[PDB]
Chain length 146, copies 3
């Protein structure tokens, strides 16, 4: 973990976000059980009958939050890892990772909590900023080593 000064901070933030995604998955299952809304007939028959194989708006919302996480957190896992080895200023790197972590946690809260628009959208944009920044820096480093 000491292979570069920014790496521990990256690994802390990334792993917290992976755990946060696992939390969303758990919540999704709990909502399916509570609302009796299952995607598979075999699940529905286990949990009350075939009429419970149905969509539910809260379940769909959970799925959207989880999908948005996959669209954003997964690229961060790649970009942040690579960026950690490019010798960025440690404090600047810390700020990139912290902005992403705070933005993404806020995003899930805003999504699952049904907060008014554009609160969720703002948190999405906020978290994308450090990702865009890291992507550009990686582009320059890669291009210049060709």
């Amino acid at each position: 973990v000491m292979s570069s000064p920014a790496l521990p901070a990256f690994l802390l933030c990334s792993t917290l976000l992976v755990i946060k995604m696992y939390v969303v998955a758990i919540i999704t299952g709990q909502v399916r059980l509570r609302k009796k809304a299952f995607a598979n007939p075999e699940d529905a028959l286990r949990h009350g009958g075939p009429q419970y194989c149905r969509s539910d708006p809260d379940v769909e919302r959970c799925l959207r939050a989880h999908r948005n996480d996959m669209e954003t957190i997964y690229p961060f896992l790649f970009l942040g890892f690579v960026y950690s080895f490019l010798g960025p200023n440690p404090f600047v790197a810390w700020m990139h990772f912290l902005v992403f972590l705070v933005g993404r946690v806020a995003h899930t809260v805003a999504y699952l909590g049904k907060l008014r628009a554009p609160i969720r959208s703002v948190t999405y944009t906020l978290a994308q900023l450090p990702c865009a920044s890291m992507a550009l820096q990686i582009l320059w480093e890669a291009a210049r080593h060709l």
Copy 2:
């Protein structure tokens, strides 16, 4: 690949799981063709007419299996890679990777094979256990190097 004793086992299991995901993608395409159920009008017109731009329960099932793979296998690719470099006991590491591999292969079999509930759900939980374990260990390593 010899940069840490656990790494070869990790790379074997991870790559098999990526290949397994590719298999799911291939199956999905085959089901679309067999059931004549396409997501795009251009595809439908190529394969029999506009009435074949339609949903199908078997196609939707394939998509759910593939999505669940992305929700679980992708985090494993990150966590298992990092975990491999934290000097875990080689046999303990092997068991983490093997439980994930077996659990995930079983999950796809249970999903696509339409096995009774909660067989699929149990395999999901089983495979998440080593991921949770690795995530916590990474958290501790990262936090302590801050």
Copy 3:
């Protein structure tokens, strides 16, 4: 970035593809706004009323393109990174990465541009070829170091 001769080319192609995914996300948002088709009631109420919480075929198409990217580009991020450290011929490695990059950019153009079938499908197959190749090579390297 100089830890292996193929790594800079990999990092260039991967980061361009991550940026390309961000472009798809931006396009998706623009289409939602233009077509007034939102997934969340809170979004719809901010942007004209509850009747705009609705599906739209162009939005759904954008989501499919983005999902297919996650199904293919994310595994490439893993496979290409590992493959870069296995000492492949630099030119051969370059060709693997370039075929994937060109295939995937073409895929998004074919998908969002609604090009006739099977143009999109061909680009998908084309880009999967270097991924399959890298996966097999990693399997052999991992297996032989067990």
